[PDB]
Amino acid sequence: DLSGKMVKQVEILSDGIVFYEIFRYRLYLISEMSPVNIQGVDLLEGNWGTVGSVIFFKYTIDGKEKTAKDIVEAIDEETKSVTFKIVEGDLMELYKTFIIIVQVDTKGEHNSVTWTFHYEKLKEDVEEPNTLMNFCIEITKDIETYH
Template sequence: MSSLSGKLVSSIEINSCSDVFHDIFRHRPHQISEMSPTKIKACDLHEGDWGTVGSVIFWNYTHDGKEKVAKEIIESIDEEKKSVKFKVVEGDLLELYKSFSLTCHVDTDGEKNLVTWTLEYEKLNESVEDPHTLMEFCLHVTKDIEAHHA
């Protein structure tokens, strides 16, 4: 990896059922705007079908106090590992990053349900910061979804 490439990984414990959480990100991401309305404004399907690899999803969201957009392709789904990987193909993130992918993985560790977010990216240049605030955003959305299902 070059010095411009990076990877952030963070996990958060949830009380919600891991199957429900995975189902939301796989089949029902368009409902996240109801669960986290201050962060996710809308999520629309542009191509394909919900929950299928190759489908294109368009997000309107608020990050760092600014309205932003992202067009993502569902790159992979692993039912056994309960993970969904999204690759950003258009939008605000690509003004800072040459490439950007997000993976949401839900795991049960004994009594605990953990949601792990992995952000993989390549910065356009050295002055671009690592996406720590975006990781915080993902963790906050996770807690909003959990609160909605409490």
């Protein structure tokens, strides 16, 4: 009832493996590649690119500054998939739980990035995270055009 599901897949003209490795290993590169959207990525715990690593994001949605604390819950090297779990931040004001999965198709001539949100809302009249999805899409376009 309160749980929901959001998926968006976009093609990328950039290299799919590079794109995947950024989200696994090199989140820190994101803030230079999309400075409007993300001001900073801090590794709070663990090593970059491992399940259990904990991370702090400073970002801006609709020109309003926000922060998130994520744990990497799963990684699958075969499908090139990284799962992030939000445990603190502004989104936890609206949603009880929120998961984000980035999964990158690389084996084919056309490469794509798929984004999947799995969430549970605190109340029925909480909005769908469309603003969060467009934002992930903007980021993907920036990484893609960075070269």
